Design a protein around this ligand. Structure first.
Ligand SMILES: O=c1ccn([C@@H]2O[C@H](COP(=O)(O)O)[C@@H](O)[C@H]2O)c(=O)[nH]1
Ligand SMILES: O=c1ccn([C@@H]2O[C@H](COP(=O)(O)O)[C@@H](O)[C@H]2O)c(=O)[nH]1
Lengths: 224, 222
């Protein structure tokens, strides 16, 4: 169970594949987001599966229940390991998505909810009609996600321990915004996040921009 | 006469979708590619539609951090789509960044539209996600945020259309789904008269034995 999910945020297929060729699929999982999926589609995800990697399809679906569920079903058809949706889409939308994956069995993708994007501070939330403190809104949405029957949520390292306390050990926490010691004490390290309760670490640049990415991943894995 | 109908392509198989597109003309409608078909068939499907002469509304409702949402919108511009949308709930900065990344494309950029409150959300659903304001008021708040962020318009219901035009202007485009050809559900003529700039219609056309006739009846009623 590799804990690191490497973020692939390239605007060029050649560079992305050149990078993946340097990595052992038993040492990490990969994340394909809106940029690469909009540019290269499901064939890129298939290219990653052909290479032996498990993928986290980070498309944060957010639409009416019928549509969101069909998008999640499409992710299951692609055979991805994990897929996410916005908790702001509501309990009904999330429940419908979890229901449509039941026939896929034990191999279905893990279905994760997005609470409050890290880019949203109080002023940003007030702009979209949310008056609650961001931390309280995160708990509200994470709880809604668990109640809808989802597998976990994406959360920051700072939010991890509190979520794990309120929602339980089995509810999975996927955490981006991690940096190896060195390279700010305010940003948690992989070890600090895992200790806090993060189940998976989403790491991009520290690995993708490294001269020797296989070495950086080995160092991260060894530190855990 | 510029076509006002955008036909929703919500198929789970490519053969069926293309069999339909082969029987309608791009001078009579535009097409909408949503999360289902894009997740299943990707940008190559949009390219097939473009090769056939159709303009496409890429309905992926991007909602992410500003850097990512903007790179997704830029990707839509690279694909050459006519229109693309994002969630207004993503915030003013996310929306503004998405509009700013399109500047280098000049007039070839796609139209950028905001999604306000999904039709599936009534008061109970909104309260569940921490929104206590009346859905109608929340729609105006989000639509206003979208205009202030520099976007071209929003997706809205036929009922919301006239009020949005009154507050945001004739130049702020309104894309309206939930329309049915001819009493609570507005007809194409009723929605256009209210301010809708485009009408998103799926099943009445995609399930028809004679889609061209249905489109002509709709178009001739405007
Ligand atoms: O608070 C954060 C931090 C990072 N990321 C995303 O997680 C991945 C890893 O980021 P990085 O390690 O390259 O900064 C990227 O896709 C980045 O956009 C977030 O979604 N939220
Ligand atoms: O209130 C609505 C009504 C319809 N649709 C969408 O608009 C398209 C046309 O719907 P229909 O004409 O097939 O009902 C479909 O993609 C449908 O999911 C909405 O998003 N909101």
């Amino acid at each position: 169970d590799p804990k690191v999910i490497v973020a692939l945020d390239y605007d060029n297929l050649a560079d992305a594949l050149a990078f993946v060729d340097k990595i052992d699929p038993s040492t990490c999982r990969l994340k394909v987001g809106k940029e690469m999926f909009t540019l290269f589609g499901p064939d890129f995800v298939r290219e990653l599966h052909k290479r032996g990697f498990s993928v986290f399809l980070d498309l944060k679906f957010h639409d009416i229940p019928n549509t969101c569920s069909k998008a999640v079903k499409a992710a299951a058809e692609l055979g991805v390991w994990m897929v996410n949706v916005h908790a702001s889409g509501g309990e009904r939308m999330m429940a419908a998505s979890r229901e449509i994956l039941e026939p896929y069995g034990k191999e279905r993708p893990l279905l994760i909810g997005v609470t409050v994007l890290t880019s949203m501070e109080s002023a940003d939330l007030q702009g979209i009609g949310i008056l609650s403190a961001p931390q309280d809104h995160v708990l509200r949405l994470a709880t809604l996600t668990k109640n809808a029957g989802l597998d976990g949520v994406v959360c920051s390292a700072q939010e991890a321990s509190l979520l794990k306390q309120h929602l339980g050990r089995e509810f999975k926490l996927v955490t981006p915004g991690i940096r190896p010691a060195g390279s700010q004490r305010r940003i948690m390290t992989p070890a600090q996040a895992i200790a806090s309760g993060s189940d998976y670490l989403v790491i991009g640049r520290p690995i993708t921009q490294a001269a020797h990415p296989e070495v950086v991943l080995e160092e991260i894995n060894s530190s855990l």
